[PDB]
Amino acid sequence: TPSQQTVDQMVDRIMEFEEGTRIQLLAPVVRGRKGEYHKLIEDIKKEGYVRIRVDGEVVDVNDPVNLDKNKKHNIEIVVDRLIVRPGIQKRLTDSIETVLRLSNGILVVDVIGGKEMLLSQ
Amino acid sequence: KPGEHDLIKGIEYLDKVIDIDQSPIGRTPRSNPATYTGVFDFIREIFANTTEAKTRGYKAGRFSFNVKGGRCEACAGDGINVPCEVCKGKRYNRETLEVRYKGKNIAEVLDMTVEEALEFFKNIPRIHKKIETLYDVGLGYIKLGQSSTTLSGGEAQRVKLATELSRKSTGKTMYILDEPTTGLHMADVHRLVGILHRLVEAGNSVVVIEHNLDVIKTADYIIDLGPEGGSGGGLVVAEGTPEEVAKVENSYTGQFLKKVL
Amino acid sequence: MHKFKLVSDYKPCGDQPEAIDKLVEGINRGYRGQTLLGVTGSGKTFTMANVIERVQKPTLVIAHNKTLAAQLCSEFKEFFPNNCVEYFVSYYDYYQPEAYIPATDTYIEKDSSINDEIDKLRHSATAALFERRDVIIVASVSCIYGLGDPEDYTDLMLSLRPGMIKDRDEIIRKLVDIQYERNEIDFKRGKFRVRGDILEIFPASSSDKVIRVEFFGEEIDRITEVDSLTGEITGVCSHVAIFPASHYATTKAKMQRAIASIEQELEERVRELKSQGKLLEAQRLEQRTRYDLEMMQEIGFCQGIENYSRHISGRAPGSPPFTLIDYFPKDFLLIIDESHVTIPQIGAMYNGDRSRKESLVEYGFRLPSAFDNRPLTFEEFEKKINQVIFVSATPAKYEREHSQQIVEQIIRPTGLLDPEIVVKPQIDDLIGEISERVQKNQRVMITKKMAEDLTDYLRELDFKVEYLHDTIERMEIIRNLRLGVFDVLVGINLLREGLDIPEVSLVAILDADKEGFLRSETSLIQTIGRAARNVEGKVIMYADTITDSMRRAIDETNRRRKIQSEYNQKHGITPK
Numbered sequence: 001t002p003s004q005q006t007v008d009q010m011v012d013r014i015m016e017f018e019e020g021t022r023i024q025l026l027a028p029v030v031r032g033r034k035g036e037y038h039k040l041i042e043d044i045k046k047e048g049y050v051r052i053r054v055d056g057e058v059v060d061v062n063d064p065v066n067l068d069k070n071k072k073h074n075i076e077i078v079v080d081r082l083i084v085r086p087g088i089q090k091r092l093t094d095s096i097e098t099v100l101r102l103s104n105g106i107l108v109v110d111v112i113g114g115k116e117m118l119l120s121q
Numbered sequence: 122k123p124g125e126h127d128l129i130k131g132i133e134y135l136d137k138v139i140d141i142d143q144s145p146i147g148r149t150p151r152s153n154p155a156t157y158t159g160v161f162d163f164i165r166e167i168f169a170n171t172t173e174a175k176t177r178g179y180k181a182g183r184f185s186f187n188v189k190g191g192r193c194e195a196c197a198g199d200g201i202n203v204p205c206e207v208c209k210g211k212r213y214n215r216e217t218l219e220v221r222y223k224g225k226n227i228a229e230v231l232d233m234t235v236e237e238a239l240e241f242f243k244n245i246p247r248i249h250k251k252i253e254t255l256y257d258v259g260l261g262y263i264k265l266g267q268s269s270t271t272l273s274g275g276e277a278q279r280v281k282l283a284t285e286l287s288r289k290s291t292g293k294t295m296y297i298l299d300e301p302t303t304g305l306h307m308a309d310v311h312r313l314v315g316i317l318h319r320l321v322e323a324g325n326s327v328v329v330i331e332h333n334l335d336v337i338k339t340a341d342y343i344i345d346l347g348p349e350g351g352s353g354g355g356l357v358v359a360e361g362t363p364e365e366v367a368k369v370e371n372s373y374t375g376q377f378l379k380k381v382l
Numbered sequence: 383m384h385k386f387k388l389v390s391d392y393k394p395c396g397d398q399p400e401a402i403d404k405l406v407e408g409i410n411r412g413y414r415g416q417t418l419l420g421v422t423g424s425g426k427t428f429t430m431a432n433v434i435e436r437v438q439k440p441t442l443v444i445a446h447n448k449t450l451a452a453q454l455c456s457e458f459k460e461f462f463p464n465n466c467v468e469y470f471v472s473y474y475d476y477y478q479p480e481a482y483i484p485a486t487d488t489y490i491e492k493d494s495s496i497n498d499e500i501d502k503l504r505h506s507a508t509a510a511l512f513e514r515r516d517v518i519i520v521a522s523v524s525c526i527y528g529l530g531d532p533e534d535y536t537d538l539m540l541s542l543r544p545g546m547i548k549d550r551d552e553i554i555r556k557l558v559d560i561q562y563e564r565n566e567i568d569f570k571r572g573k574f575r576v577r578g579d580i581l582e583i584f585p586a587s588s589s590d591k592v593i594r595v596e597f598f599g600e601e602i603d604r605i606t607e608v609d610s611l612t613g614e615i616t617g618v619c620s621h622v623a624i625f626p627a628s629h630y631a632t633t634k635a636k637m638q639r640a641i642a643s644i645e646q647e648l649e650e651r652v653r654e655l656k657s658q659g660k661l662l663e664a665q666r667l668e669q670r671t672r673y674d675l676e677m678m679q680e681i682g683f684c685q686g687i688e689n690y691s692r693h694i695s696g697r698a699p700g701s702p703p704f705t706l707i708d709y710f711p712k713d714f715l716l717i718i719d720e721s722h723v724t725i726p727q728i729g730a731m732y733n734g735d736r737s738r739k740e741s742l743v744e745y746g747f748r749l750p751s752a753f754d755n756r757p758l759t760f761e762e763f764e765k766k767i768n769q770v771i772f773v774s775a776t777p778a779k780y781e782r783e784h785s786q787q788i789v790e791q792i793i794r795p796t797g798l799l800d801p802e803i804v805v806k807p808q809i810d811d812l813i814g815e816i817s818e819r820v821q822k823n824q825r826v827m828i829t830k831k832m833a834e835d836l837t838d839y840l841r842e843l844d845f846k847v848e849y850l851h852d853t854i855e856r857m858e859i860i861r862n863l864r865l866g867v868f869d870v871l872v873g874i875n876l877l878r879e880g881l882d883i884p885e886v887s888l889v890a891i892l893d894a895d896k897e898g899f900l901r902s903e904t905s906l907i908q909t910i911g912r913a914a915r916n917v918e919g920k921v922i923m924y925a926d927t928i929t930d931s932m933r934r935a936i937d938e939t940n941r942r943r944k945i946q947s948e949y950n951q952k953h954g955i956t957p958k
């Protein structure tokens with residue numbers, strides 16, 4: 001043993017949580033980098049996504065934002081804000097698939113009130 | 122580019138050509154009878170045309186186990202890494218194995234035998250023609266998804282024969298076969314001879330480069346070549362019906378046919 | 383309720399105001415049919431725009447060819463930039479309908495190609511019909527072919543508002559059911575994509591507006607609009623509706639009823655054919671119907687679904703299909719451009735379709751119910767007409783007999799005059815006339831063996847020729863004639879659209895005394911009208927005999943020339 005997870009494995013791992021928990025699926029496009037990051041934000045907004053969390057705070061992509069070019073920022077795209085209950089396998093799998101496609105094999109599950117976890121292919 | 126010749130006359134009497142060559146068949150884990158015969162493309166299109174696949178935004182490549190769009194990543198689309206456990210070795214993830222055509226997903230369709238697929242696909246004509254040809258060559262017991270690496274020589278040869286003989290016939294096509302008997306028992310030869318004679322009776326023309334006497338004795342015309350191999354050959358030693366060739370003293374094929382007819 | 387607004391610097395001149403007033407008065411009175419006797423170059427499009435603006439009613443214009451329809455659509459867009467102008471023509475680049483020939487026992491499969499721009503224009507026209515009343519549609523004879531049910535089109539509209547609880551999967555299924563394709567890579571008209579909790583829909587009607595919805599739990603929060611190019615917020619709307627992406631939108635219950643009816647009809651036809659003796663045809667029909675029924679049950683739609691239109695829509699046997707005329711309001715106005723050619727085109731479609739399908743149904747290939755998937759007959763089209771106006775240079779018997787009022791527009795605004803007629807009892811005279819025209823920098827025109835002999839003589843005697851044996855070569859020949867590469871042109875059939883030129887000042891008719899379709903009165907008038915472009919253009923005839931049609935044509939030409947000369951002399955307008 002050298003975490004390589006498939007879509008089904010990630011779905012099962014998320015399903016292992018208790019019912020009623022609030023989770024958010026994130027696609028981190030930038031992890032530990034410094035830059036103005038304006039063209040990327042414009043492209044993300046044009047793609048269709050509206051919710052983006054920066055520095056751990058959720059902000060709207062439409063509203064203008066400011067960030068230091070010499071300070072590291074963790075830009076993450078909020079894709080879905082689901083609930084944990086039986087029968088949401090299809091929507092959860094679709095959201096995980098689009099997150100993996102957008103972030104190139106990196107998925108971050110934000111457990112509201114719990115410890116965050118990271119799953120990768 | 123063709124070979125060295127002056128000219129060929131009579132091409133205006135034909136409208137198509139279908140050829141089975143004397144070449145090895147490649148064995149890969151990504152190949153099976155369904156993919157080789159080209160019917161898996163139609164099956165995948167049918168599956169991708171369903172309402173569930175449209176709702177989930179799937180395409181024909183999603184249902185291919187060689188495409189990294191819907192295949193299981195734990196087994197890398199092969200099913201075995203020891204059989205896979207997350208996808209149970211089916212090479213498809215759980216979401217792909219939910220689009221059902223006539224209440225059956227792609228894995229069970231791949232798990233059908235040719236005889237089963239004859240009844241299941243009895244309405245779609247494009248699939249039915251290929252499945253019927255596979256049944257005709259005598260491969261009714263084979264599975265549509267059996268790995269080509271686990272196919273025998275005769276089974277692979279018959280899959281190739283069905284692939285090439287399941288094509289459209291316009292009544293003026295030319296069939297060329299280069300020793301299609303390799304690895305075939307006397308019953309499979311009987312089946313192939315019946316198929317070829319039905320094709321000829323449909324108005325077509327069949328040319329077979331054969332060494333089998335059972336096939337030869339049923340031929341209407343024979344063009345012997347020789348009298349030896351290499352630099353000692355390249356001349357027509359006999360030409361006519363099998364009896365006329367048998368009447369030729371210096372022809373080996375005639376000598377061997379004399380004891381058969 | 384929007385209105386009609388017209389912008390044009392060119393004011394009506396001559397008989398245009400009188401013609402417009404007469405047409406408006408006749409429409410207000412309630413006359414079912416009228417005719418505009420407008421000569422070429424008199425500005426019939428301007429008069430049409432004026433009457434449409436004055437009446438303030440929906441207008442459907444029918445043309446006998448695609449080029450004229452496109453020109454009319456562009457002109458109407460020019461006169462009405464604020465208003466709405468549509469375009470409804472065939473979208474088939476290459477269509478080969480299936481048919482069976484019992485003589486050769488050969489069957490040909492169906493092959494078709496779809497043009498995206500024409501399909502988008504047709505969908506825009508259909509949507510605009512239900513959206514705004516002040517819409518003008520320029521269409522070919524395709525307007526009489528079977529479209530979908532307007533009731534199904536209206537009843538299958540998705541309505542979304544904020545605060546309405548609804549699952550995202552349910553909305554996706556509803557969108558798929560109205561023939562919307564999900565494609566996150568190729569995002570074009572009539573396609574939708576979903577990115578997590580946000581669903582984006584691109585209607586097939588609009589071309590630069592998308593609708594974005596957001597889900598928070600189990601209810602929709604915001605429904606906004608975003609430009610397709612910039613991808614930025616444009617506006618927020620509370621109540622929005624999505625039109626179906628196909629006119630042929632059907633419900634699941636309708637599909638099940640159609641399947642049951644098709645099964646019953648197939649059983650009845652199989653029994654009848656068994657009682658007849660055509661076993662092979664019955665078996666082929668049973669196999670094809672079973673395949674189509676399985677395809678309907680599993681997927682829902684496929685190739686060949688058009689043959690079961692009567693069963694799908696539930697129409698009674700023999701009923702005409704719903705068409706674009708049914709989509710129009712009952713108080714609409716219809717205008718037929720070049721009526722003497724368009725009307726026979728309308729009439730011929732039903733006979734052609736029935737002749738094509740008779741062999742197919744007879745040999746047990748399609749069910750007998752496939753006869754109802756037919757274009758409208760002439761009687762049904764006439765019955766569906768609320769108000770009609772025929773705009774043609776020469777009215778035929780039908781238009782003259784079916785019109786309650788006849789008005790004319792002869793005086794051209796530019797002040798041109800119709801060419802005079804000179805008769806002659808021929809090769810030497812033609813050569814001399816051609817040489818004289820060459821000396822005056824005027825092109826000549828000549829209207830198969832005789833044409834070949836004439837072109838051979840012209841080529842021999844150091845004369846440039848432009849002999850014509852499609853439109854692709856036609857425009858090239860016209861450009862060559864305009865550039866002066868060829869001095870004369872010879873054609874077997876001098877009636878192709880767009881073959882007229884403004885530099886032609888002399889046209890000759892050879893063997894006009896011989897009876898023929900091209901020598902009819904209407905054809906003679908049409909060929910004479912080509913020489914009216916030149917200020918000094920004249921028409922000569924080479925025939926030793928005269929007929930009643932010739933007498934009528936010459937009388938009409940003389941009257942038109944006399945009235946044009948009187949108008950130009952009394953008013954003092956210089957002909958230029």
Ligand SMILES: Nc1ncnc2c1ncn2[C@@H]1O[C@H](COP(=O)(O)OP(=O)(O)NP(=O)(O)O)[C@@H](O)[C@H]1O
Nearest residue numbers: 262263267270271272273274275276277304305306
């Ligand atoms: N690895 C395998 N696992 C399972 N079944 C196999 C495998 N390899 C071959 N088979 C099947 O086992 C049967 C016998 O195969 P094989 O022993 O190769 O036949 P064979 O008698 O040599 N035939 P042939 O060479 O064509 O005359 C066939 O149905 C094969 O498809």
Ligand SMILES: [Zn+2]
Nearest residue numbers: 193196205208
């Ligand atoms: Zn696996």
